[PDB]
Design a binder for these strands. Structure first.
Lengths: 205, 150, 123, 80, 129
RNA sequence: ACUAUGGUUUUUAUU
RNA sequence: GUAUGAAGAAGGCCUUCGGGUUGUAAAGUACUUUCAGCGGGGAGGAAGGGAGUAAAGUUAAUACCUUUGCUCAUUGACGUUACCCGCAGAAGAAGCACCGGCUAACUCCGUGCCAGCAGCCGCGGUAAUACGGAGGGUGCAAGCGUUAAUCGGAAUUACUGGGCGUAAAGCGCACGCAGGCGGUUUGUUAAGUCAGAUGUGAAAUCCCCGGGCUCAACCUGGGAACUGCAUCUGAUACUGGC
RNA sequence: UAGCUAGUAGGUGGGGUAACGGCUCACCUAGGCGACGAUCCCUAGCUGGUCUGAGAGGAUGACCAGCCACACUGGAACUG
């Protein structure tokens, strides 16, 4: 499935910035961050108390653009080798191809990166992949096809990547548009905007 | 450190001829999120005072849980009135699982790797006294290595 | 119980039966329809509600509830009967479909059209 | 080794046969508990030397009677 | 009336603890004495005596500590009408290494610790910690 | 010494 | 579709009358064809057979019947095909169910015990989040729902693990024909049990880990699950027999 | 549904079969079953699997493996 609708309405109803509708052409992002949604979302919560972990789960889903049933799969693979479901979950989400293409800077958002992947413009190990959920391996090479390399869409995103946060776990060259993903993302340089104490009893009602 | 938790609330259904009474009874637990737990029950006017009247007791009966490598040594059974319980060590995140009236007791002790279930003629405010009876029955390294003789 | 009991036979349990056997393990079956009657409500409610008497493909004859607004039902024209109870109707375990067969149609809805069976405008 | 069983003789008046009582332990395959069960075997005997209540050793080889393959080998203590 | 030689043994070791009685008596048998020796070797009782010839009597000296009994966990976890047996590789663990199970082997009464030491299975007759 | 009865039914969420 | 776009338009809805909101959504303007449509090329499934050329075959080593390398030139239903390269243009692509609580989403107007709503409790008589209308939300998504069949919840069938004074079940009360249970010494039997050798719970597959086609379905290389299990040569500590 | 047998049960002598047995054909006798549910009835292919559950337990044995039974309905005989 996919949303297909007004994009800033997502960042508003999640109370979280998704890099949607902002960029080098807007002032102070002009995305009304921390202004409350609608006329009932402007009022105090009634705390079920299940509602606060549902707020925090939707937030981490919406950042990485992930569906509920697919997040119930990440919550199952995160628990492996006793890796902590509040830590390895973020290393798997941050290791998605549609997030790695956004971190390498070939798109301005994870949604632009997902559309470059699904439209067959992205390659890994020199081979084409259309799967946005693809889990990127250590010491593997990501590249872009020449018909997309011809477009301003991808070069404007690399010019935006020089004014943005550079991650430590991957390298990229903007002249060839080719990046090496080096090692697993770790807690020391990965920064998460959620309480790890709200993701401890998920799917157990 | 400190952990305080609310499990359930009850209202006394009486109509005091003026209307339905504002008398409430709360079920609570208190711990540290590292290895301590105590059990709270109390009755007062409105929920914001009944929660304090219940945690009054949880602070007065708090004990340390005998853990071995961050979980229990053995499977153990607990009893109080009509309620029975069975509690056993498990693995990381495979204890919870367990429903709200066990989840609260385990999360104030900071554990997610212990499984618990209630059995028999259960009553919402008595199952916690059986859960704690299984932790009073739980073996500690206090006498086992000092008793074989000699 | 002794160690010498509860063995060699599994002992009794509950059964569903089913409670709606005239549908023969289906959710719905068609039937001819002969009569419509006006029924009394339960004491908490003020109404007079309609039910139909319907013989099915298998010769079994049931009473079914009529939900929604109004009826023009006829003798032997056929309607579709569904499994599902509304306890506020006396002696009934069954429901009528309106969007199916020769049954009494319904118009003008924006929400819920998969019940009543209502087409949306295009022109 | 061919399979053998032991039991006490219960009838002998026949000229080419004897009847033997067998009491052996059997369980329910998934409910456990071994219990002793009493059965009766029809055995072929052309030596005709056995007495009643005496323990005999018998085996299943080939058909000699209607649905019956059991035959006599020996006595165990020859009690009279 | 009397079906099994230890159905009256475990209760008489468990009971009398609240009154802190330093002794208990019972009718004696080969299995009761074979168990009393391992309960002395594992420190659960301090002494055992046999007295008689044709129907002997057994006296056990019970063990105590400061304000407490010492035998706080004792169960059969089996019944004479529906007994429990285990293979040499499958003898039961008790308190994940802090207790012991008692086994009747083809070489006599011993702990599962000592049956596994020898490479034997048998009947499980008591659980103590 | 001295008696039979009367269908049906109701009132807030909140720190 | 993507980006930009603010007298935040035209039109709706709520409106402690203080103002908020649908919503960057739209128009306006710029950018690009995944996929679909039409066009051009084009992979493997293809061995053997045919022709050349060799042979300590067996005899007669260029018949016939056989044997092993190296070359040429080929056998295609699937197929109006995988895969690749073209052409105009956002162009051809969005619904339906849910919002009283449990169990995700909140209100107004109208109706006023009427008419409808229908898991159960219930909602309906003047702001009804439950009905009709409508705006705003929510879970799914080219699918969405409503019901039905079986399991889980089910300790309400109790192997894991139940109950019997009464609240539900101890025979109304007796004898004992079949069945069961039952000290001690010393032998004996090999059904239950055990050891030494041997085999073994197959393939596919849930669970866990690596490959072949992008993840992967599917197919495959290893584990684990499968609380399992057969034949002999021997033992008699223990139970049941004698 | 608590009762059932009388080729049933134990012996004699023959026939037939690739081979074995009351398989099957003739005489001498009165024995032989049944509650681990016989008698009399009512249903149903079996397993690996598969659906469900933590598993035990339950449903289903049809889509992938492998057996088995049948030929409108029921017979009878030959070939090999």
């Amino acid at each position: 499935a996919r949303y297909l609708g007004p994009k800033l309405k997502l960042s508003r109803r999640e109370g979280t910035d998704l890099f949607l509708k902002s960029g080098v052409r807007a002032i102070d992002t002009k995305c009304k961050i921390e202004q409350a949604p609608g006329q009932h979302g402007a009022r105090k919560p009634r705390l079920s108390d299940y509602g606060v972990q549902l707020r925090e789960k939707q937030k981490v889903r919406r950042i990485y653009g992930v569906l509920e049933r697919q997040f119930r799969n990440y919550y199952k693979e995160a628990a492996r080798l006793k890796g902590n479901t509040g830590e390895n979950l973020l290393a798997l989400l941050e290791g998605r191809l549609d997030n790695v293409v956004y971190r390498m800077g070939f798109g301005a958002t994870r949604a632009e990166a997902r559309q470059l992947v699904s439209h067959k413009a992205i390659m890994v190990n020199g081979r084409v992949v259309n799967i946005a959920s693809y889990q990127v391996s250590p010491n593997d090479v990501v590249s872009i096809r020449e018909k997309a390399k011809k477009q301003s869409r991808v070069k404007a995103a690399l010019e935006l990547a020089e004014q943005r946060e550079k991650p430590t776990w991957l390298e990229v060259d903007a002249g060839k548009m080719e990046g090496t993903f080096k090692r697993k993302p770790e807690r020391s340089d990965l920064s998460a905007d959620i309480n790890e104490h709200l993701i401890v009893e998920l799917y157990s009602k | 450190e400190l952990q305080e938790k609310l499990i359930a609330v009850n209202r006394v259904s009486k109509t005091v001829k003026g209307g339905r009474i504002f008398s409430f009874t709360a079920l609570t637990v208190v711990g540290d999120g590292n290895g301590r737990v105590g059990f709270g029950y109390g009755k007062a006017r409105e929920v914001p005072a009944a929660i304090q009247k219940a945690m009054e007791k949880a602070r007065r009966n708090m004990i340390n849980v005998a853990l071995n490598n961050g979980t229990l040594q053995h499977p153990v059974k607990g009893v109080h009135t009509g309620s029975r319980v069975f509690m056993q060590p498990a693995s990381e995140g495979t204890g919870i699982i367990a429903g709200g009236a066990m989840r609260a007791v385990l999360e104030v002790a900071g554990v997610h790797n212990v499984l618990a279930k209630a059995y028999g003629s259960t009553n919402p405010i008595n199952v916690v006294r059986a859960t704690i009876d299984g932790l009073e029955n739980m073996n500690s390294p206090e006498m086992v290595a000092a008793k074989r003789g000699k | 119980a002794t160690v010498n009991q509860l063995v060699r036979k599994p002992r009794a349990r509950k059964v569903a039966k089913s409670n709606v056997p005239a549908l023969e393990a289906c959710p719905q079956k068609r039937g001819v329809c002969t009569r419509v009657y006006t029924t009394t409500p339960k004491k908490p409610n003020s109404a007079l509600r309609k039910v139909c008497r319907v013989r099915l493909t298998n010769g079994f004859e049931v009473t079914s509830y009529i939900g929604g607004e109004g009826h023009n039902l006829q003798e032997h024209s056929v309607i579709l009967i569904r499994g599902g109870r509304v306890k506020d109707l006396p002696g009934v375990r069954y429901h009528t479909v309106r969007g199916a067969l020769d049954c009494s149609g319904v118009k003008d809805r924006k929400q819920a059209r998969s019940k009543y069976g209502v087409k949306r405008p295009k022109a | 080794k061919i399979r053998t069983l032991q039991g006490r003789v219960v009838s002998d008046k026949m000229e080419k046969s004897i009847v033997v009582a067998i009491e052996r332990f059997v369980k329910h395959p998934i409910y456990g508990k071994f219990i002793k069960r009493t059965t009766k075997l029809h055995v072929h005997d052309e030596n005709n030397e056995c007495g009643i209540g005496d323990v005999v050793e018998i085996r299943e080889c080939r058909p000699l009677s209607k649905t019956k393959s059991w035959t006599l080998v020996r006595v165990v203590e020859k009690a009279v | 009336s009397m079906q099994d030689p230890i159905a009256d043994m475990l209760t008489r070791i468990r009971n009398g603890q609240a009154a802190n009685k330093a002794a208990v008596t019972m009718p004696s048998s080969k299995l009761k004495v074979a168990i009393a020796n391992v309960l002395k070797e594992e420190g659960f009782i301090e002494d055992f005596k046999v007295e008689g010839d044709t129907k002997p009597e057994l006296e056990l000296t019970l063990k105590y500590f400061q304000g407490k009994a010492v035998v706080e966990s004792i169960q059969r976890v089996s019944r004479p009408g529906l007994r429990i047996y285990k293979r040499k590789d499958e003898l039961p663990k008790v308190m994940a290494g802090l207790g012991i199970a008692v086994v009747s082997t083809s070489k006599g009464v011993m702990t599962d610790r000592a049956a596994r030491q020898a490479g034997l299975g048998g009947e499980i007759i008591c659980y103590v910690a």
